[PDB]
Design a protein around this ligand. Structure first.
Ligand code: ANP
Ligand code: ADP
Ligand code: MG
Ligand code: MG
Lengths: 487, 466, 22, 467, 127, 156
């Protein structure tokens, strides 16, 4: 039967050329006689080019390949929460079978133009720099980008850790399920990752999809889509999901491997002509649904690794242009002590204010302006002794807001804690404080307001902003505190 | 006739026909699918086999699957019924408002108007926007480069151009979203509904919408511009209009061409672009023009990769542009709307042989004074304002007044602001700026010229202030 | 002249002509 | 079953089998050679013909020459008996000391340890090297990478690590010479006989050696890393032991593959490399690891082609490491050795909750002053030193001294420096840099801090430079 | 080795400091010495073509520099010095060169003899 | 480029012309630091010829190293020693230029042929500081050094 089955003509480098299989569909999952799966990516007149899901040693010339009536779908649902799975949804944490009751295809069309409404609901990272200056909304695709070891995963981990404050709460609207997709990383790096999330008590609402460095190219290629469909289950059922693709640089490399070896034509950087499409169709599946469709959402944070700051290289160009904005990290900011190493001048969210609460909205506008004014005069600093007080002030206010954007790792903040801190800076209370002392000040000041002014923090939340009454409160808390600080 | 699929490699599909072959550029309908799958013939490979580029996903296709030759290229609904509707590359409605009930259909591939069909004259297409018309005016049947991005009032400028062209020229508009981000296409849709240029209730709709979204295959994204242009060509050819065609955005048209070309196994050119870069651009741009019957004037948003103006993509595009509208974030921060950079924005027809000596010299005088004002701004921060000469004090005054008189309230932005919108005729624009330079309004306060239409409203605002 | 340089041939011009100030 | 050579182009040999086809990865034995010639099956080409890469030179081969399937991948001796010994890619002794009498053999191809086998334990591994210990410290059982272009100090640095760490290590060491210099293998071999970590007379040897240098054809350099790795894998599991694994140079694995890639019929990926670069590296690197069964501390010298760290090869390697030491030619050009870029070297354990906030705060302080000085360099270099703030020129003088205090005379480098080698304990490194940051040595000249061990030697040298 | 053992790293530090000091601003005694030494050794390392030097003659020339005996000789004179010095030790001191060549080292005796030659020669040379 | 790059090894003397040198008006537009000859050897051309050449080349190379500083900050930030190298080098650059009989239409000068001994002497003298008092322009587009002098006098 050369219609439902075939034999292997040639096999090498994860590519089986198969004779027969006259009835296979494009992209269909076939099965080799050893039990390895494959995907039918090239259907040619005289062979099927099959992409191998495992080691080649298990496939020989003349091996029987069968269509199985298989369908590229993944386990889907809340039983994936707290679990580590591979590209296909198999458990790899060793805690037994997933209790999955529903399944979803990995390749599916994104919501069209009509099932959507504008992005409105805050997706809260707990990172001052981001929530204030590069704010993210539910349904948004926001790119995390920078050279190696600039802090990219950290932005994502802290975001995931942050959701606990809402998930432990009793408001359902505010809750966020998390999906972390590790593509091309090493297993021990992923292990440390899940360890961190476990210690943070973040795993109970997180699905970890992992296609690591030794997994066959096609699994690394599928993983983001697999993780995506697990998030769509939430999105499509009146619920909200966050997904991190870490990273899409490595996914592209994996797909390039496949296209090149299938002898599809190479373009720039040897990438094929459908690699933009590859990523565009993944990222469009993040969406904010309208109320007719449950009002759910999927928010995506793709990660891209640049090389020596080249945002104009091919894959970065693609994902930059696809997404709704970018958080750019830089090595030189990092070692200057600006951590998180976010470039505030270059980073952007095109959703913007639409995804901020009124409290943050207020103080963040002033900070944005004063930092922008700072950036213009920033070079007059180290080479300025004889400056006018007008530009001396802009510099002083600037260096101080910059200090307030610094933040420790693994400790995301509540929005009202963030506004309280920024308030201190934007209102000028820290202008006479020495720059080196600001981080110490914030920690202490925040520890104080959390311990003794829970109701003030309770108010800024309830009121939605800083009322005249809350303003008065803060004025007297800060002034007296600062006096005590410099005693 | 009917052919069979012999090969599927991603978005490239090979179809073999037993009798007559569909010519290149023909549309082919794949049989046995949930939704429509159009394939566009790209090559004749020999042996009764054609190579096609798919307009949607090829997942699920079998070798042998039947394929119907449509007999023509991609043909889409054209006419007044497409207005306020959103269609895709292949003519389908994607606004969920049912079928698009047009009497006519039109093939998306057509050749440029012949040499005899060309207008030998260059005319301004008056927008009624002061900055545009005075300093960098639009040319009837020309192409404009729109530099901008987010936050600079770009969607408002577009929506107002749609409005002003309908109001002043009786022309309809077409918006072609090449690589439209789905989120932003939805938002754009509702912003148009909210501003009035689309109307779901009656039939006042001034724009037709054509989306080629990011998640669609290269072929789909490469063709939408033609689809949009074809819609627009109806209004020029059949109804004699001076039409507006928006392309958002032209670079993504180029990149889709680059992708398609890469998928067809064609050796890439400099910087990895398609070898047909210039012809791909030429065969589309030349359709945008003034014929004896009417005109299509195109506004094309431009992304400049790596901020390199010598990059093959913008370089090729610039060969076709007759003007540029540069939207400036610096300008918007000064409260000046529209946020047009008056010195960075240029026009090929800013030429006394075209627009007249009076239009020219006033624009030059405006440019000169705004250039001069900047030279003195270093001396402003150092010497202060009361150290300038009686000539130089007067230039600062006049230039500051000119900057503000270049701002204009938009009708499309009435809901957001409450302020009544203005469409300033060309002659009132020239007159207005003519008189500020002469020193006829030096006695007037500076803020009187801000957010104002004609110069008469600058006087009525000045009288109103205490 | 002065202590501070980067001011053209101020310092060199007087030195060519030439207890000092600056 | 017997096969026949049908084609020979360089290292790539095509072999036809009439009966049973050997699976990919199988080791074939070429008949009628003086020395054992192994071919490893790479692809099934169709028509009962396999494509193979050779593990030794293919000169002398004739179309039609007989080839036997061994039935398995390349299997090498593993166990205590490999200690003190030198093997090649295929597990043959190359030390002229006779048979390697192991009980068991192991295939050089193997599956990577599963996710459930991973450890998350990380404690600091002190080296005695100031810049490393302070700024980007190694962890026990961690993956360490030494990146550097040609001639910047990878091997000297790795020899210093073998000197400072391996000599006194309790368990076993494996050193894999991968596409490097034979001279360096002979050097290292006789230095280890000298120091007793290799004993030719008894059974006290603590180091196994595996060599496939740049005199070997690519097939051999492509697999010899796998060979070393497999030796280490045995000591990790089948003894559960603390294993040190040294590899100089792991780039040569990737380079080898690029050498044969086109003959294996691959469309080149970017920068001339195989399309499989990352997966190839993946299934290899994922074996070089600590598991629950045992601990491998791996140190891997990583060549950087054309000095470019964005080169696909080193770029793809970064994600596989827990600590990275990046060497720079710009720094070495200055006479600063080890030529570590203190603003491009990182470690997973550089964390206040792991090293304590004192270690951390000084490290971050050091990098800040170097980054600040760097951000002033190109500027004041043309605009004048005197035009600076009195606290700017204080950071400029302190950074210039810290730059120098990061340099160090290596024991292994005595023939290059003319200085006796120094080993600086952790607390002394912390203290020293901590002190320069606080202003404690603004009176001391720059050169006092250059090429010394602990901070007291910077003080001693300052006295000696006076008169 | 005795004369050149630290010179490579030293010359690398000199070139860096020569660049950093490129704007003539008050320098400490340490870097001003490194600069003086550095510029002088640079002159000793210059060499014509077709006259490769015996090791012992290289050593004696380098010795003069690395021990500081030329630290006050004007840099532009160093070459004229070397040839003058060298021709002096070749004719007059075949015994010293012989010993350095034969022993392959500078003994404490040869060191003393060398210092006496260069210092007194240099003084005569500098008259 | 592979084509010229590969030709170098086939030559006993290279004259490399430079567009940047030409654009400065220096003709023939010879790059005096990229043109070489296998007979530029003291034993073949004599030590005087050799020394003047090496001297000219050194002063031109020293000038070249100072040009980054000059382009940003200008002449005024140079030590007096540097200003002298710059002025001598710039006069040497000009004295390397020559009016060709074949290019008389373009130069507007009569073509000149300078005998070797007089070439050596002219540059020997500029290096010795003998015309540090003369203006730059005087050295441009002339034959022997005497013509430079007479051109300086004519500049009144
Ligand atoms: N706010 C912060 N403060 C201090 N350290 C941080 C912060 N954020 C990240 N780091 C540290 O900086 C290093 C890099 O962080 P990471 O999140 O791994 O960046 P990355 O770009 O994802 N790295 P990689 O994927 O390995 O290239 C790690 O050691 C982090 O612990
Ligand atoms: N730590 C060091 N101290 C002094 N000199 C060094 C040091 N490291 C390298 N060098 C110099 O640079 C050369 C190249 O170092 P090596 O380690 O062989 O380079 P690679 O990075 O190519 O392995 C050494 O032989 C030595 O001359
Ligand atoms: Mg990361
Ligand atoms: Mg080495």
């Amino acid at each position: 039967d050369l219609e439902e089955t075939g034999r292997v003509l040639s096999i090498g480098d994860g590519i089986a050329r198969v004779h027969g299989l006259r009835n296979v569909q494009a992209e269909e999952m076939v099965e080799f006689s050893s039990g390895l799966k494959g995907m039918s990516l090239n259907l040619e007149p005289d062979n099927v080019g099959v992409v191998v899901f495992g080691n080649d040693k298990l496939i020989k010339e003349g091996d029987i390949v069968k269509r199985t009536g298989a369908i590229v779908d993944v386990p889907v649902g809340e039983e994936l929460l707290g679990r580590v799975v591979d590209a296909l949804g198999n458990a790899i944490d060793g805690k037994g079978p997933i209790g999955s009751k529903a399944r979803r295809r990995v390749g599916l069309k994104a919501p069209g133009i009509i099932p959507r409404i504008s992005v409105r609901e805050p997706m809260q990272t707990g990172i001052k720099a981001v929530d204030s200056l590069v704010p993210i909304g539910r349904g948004q695709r926001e790119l995390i980008i920078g050279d190696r070891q600039t802090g990219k995963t950290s932005i994502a981990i802290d975001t995931i850790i942050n959701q606990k404050r809402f998930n432990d709460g009793t408001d359902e609207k505010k809750k966020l399920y998390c999906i972390y997709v590790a593509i091309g990383q090493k297993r021990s790096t992923v292990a440390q990752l899940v360890k961190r999330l476990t210690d943070a008590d973040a795993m109970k609402y997180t699905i970890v999809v992992s296609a690591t460095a030794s997994d066959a190219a096609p699994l690394q290629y599928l993983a983001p889509y697999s993780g995506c469909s697990m998030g769509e289950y939430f999105r499509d059922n009146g619920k909200h999901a966050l997904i991190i693709y870490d990273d899409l640089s490595k996914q592209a490399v994996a797909y390039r491997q496949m296209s090149l070896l299938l002898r599809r034509p190479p373009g720039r950087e040897a990438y094929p002509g459908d690699v933009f499409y590859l990523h565009s169709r993944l990222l469009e599946r993040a969406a904010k649904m309208n109320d007719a469709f449950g009002g759910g959402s999927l928010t995506a944070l793709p990660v891209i690794e640049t090389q020596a700051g080249d945002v104009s290289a091919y894959i970065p160009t693609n994902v930059i242009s696809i997404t709704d904005g970018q958080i750019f990290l830089e090595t030189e900011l990092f070692y200057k002590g600006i951590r998180p190493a976010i470039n505030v001048g270059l980073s952007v969210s095109r959703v913007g204010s639409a995804a901020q609460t009124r409290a943050m909205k207020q103080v963040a506008g002033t900070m944005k302006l004063e930092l922008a004014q700072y950036r213009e005069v920033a070079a007059f600093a180290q080479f300025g002794s004889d400056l006018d007080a007008a530009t001396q002030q802009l510099l002083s206010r600037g260096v101080r807001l910059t200090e307030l954007l610094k933040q420790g790792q693994y400790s995301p903040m509540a929005i009202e804690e963030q506004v309280a801190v920024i308030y201190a800076g934007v209102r000028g209370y820290l202008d006479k404080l020495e720059p080196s002392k600001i981080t110490k000040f914030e920690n202490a000041f925040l520890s104080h307001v959390i311990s003794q002014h829970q109701a003030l923090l309770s108010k800024i939340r309830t009121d939605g902003k800083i009322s005249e009454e809350s303003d008065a409160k803060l004025k007297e808390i800060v002034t007296n505190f600062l006096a005590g600080f410099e005693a | 006739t009917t052919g069979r699929i012999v090969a599927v490699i991603g978005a490239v599909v090979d179809v073999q026909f037993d009798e007559g072959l569909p010519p290149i550029l023909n549309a082919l309908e794949v049989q046995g699918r949930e939704t429509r799958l159009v394939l566009e013939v790209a090559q004749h490979l020999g042996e009764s086999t054609v190579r096609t580029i798919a307009m949607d996903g090829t997942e699920g296709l079998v070798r042998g699957q039947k394929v119907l030759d449509s007999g023509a290229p991609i043909r889409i609904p054209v006419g007044p019924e497409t207005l306020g509707r959103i269609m895709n590359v292949i003519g389908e409605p994607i606004d969920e408002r049912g079928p698009i009930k047009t009497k006519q259909f039109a093939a998306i591939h057509a050749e440029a108007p012949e040499f005899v069909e060309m207008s030998v004259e260059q005319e301004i297409l008056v927008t009624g926007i002061k900055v545009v018309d005075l300093l960098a005016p639009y040319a009837k049947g020309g192409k404009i480069g729109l530099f901008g991005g987010a936050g600079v009032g770009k969607t408002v400028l577009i929506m107002e151009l749609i409005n002003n062209v309908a109001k002043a020229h009786g022309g309809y508009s077409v918006f072609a979203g090449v690589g439209e981000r789905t989120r932003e296409g939805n938002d754009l849709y509702h912003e148009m509904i909210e501003s009035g240029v689309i109307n779901l209730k009656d039939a006042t709709s001034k724009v037709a919408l054509v989306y080629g979204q990011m998640n669609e295959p290269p072929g789909a994204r490469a063709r939408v511009a033609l689809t949009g242009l074809t819609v627009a060509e109806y209004f020029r050819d059949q109804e004699g209009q001076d039409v507006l065609l928006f392309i958002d955005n032209i670079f993504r048209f180029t990149q889709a061409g680059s992708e398609v070309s890469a998928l067809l196994g064609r050796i890439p050119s400099a910087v990895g672009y398609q070898p047909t870069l210039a012809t791909d651009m030429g065969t589309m741009q030349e359709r945008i023009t003034t014929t004896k019957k009417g005109s299509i004037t195109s506004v094309q948003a431009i992304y400049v990769p790596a901020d390199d103006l010598t990059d093959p993509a913008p370089a090729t595009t610039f060969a076709h542009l007759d003007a540029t509208t540069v939207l400036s974030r610096a300008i918007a921060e000064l409260g000046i709307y529209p946020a047009v950079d008056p010195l960075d924005s240029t026009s090929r027809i800013m030429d006394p042989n075209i627009v007249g000596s009076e239009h020219y010299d006033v624009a030059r005088g405006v440019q000169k004074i705004l250039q001069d004002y900047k030279s003195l701004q270093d001396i402003i921060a150092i010497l202060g304002m009361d150290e300038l000469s009686e000539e130089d004090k007067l230039t600062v005054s006049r230039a500051r007044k000119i900057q503000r008189f270049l701002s204009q309230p938009f009708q499309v932005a009435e809901v957001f602001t409450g302020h009544l919108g203005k469409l300033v005729p060309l002659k009132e624009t020239i007159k207005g700026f003519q008189q500020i330079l002469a020193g006829e309004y030096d006695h007037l306060p500076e803020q009187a010229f801000y957010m104002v239409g004609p110069i008469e409203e600058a006087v009525a605002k000045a009288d109103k202030l205490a | 002249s002065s202590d501070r340089g980067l001011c053209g041939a101020i310092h060199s011009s007087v030195a060519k002509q030439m207890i000092g100030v600056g």
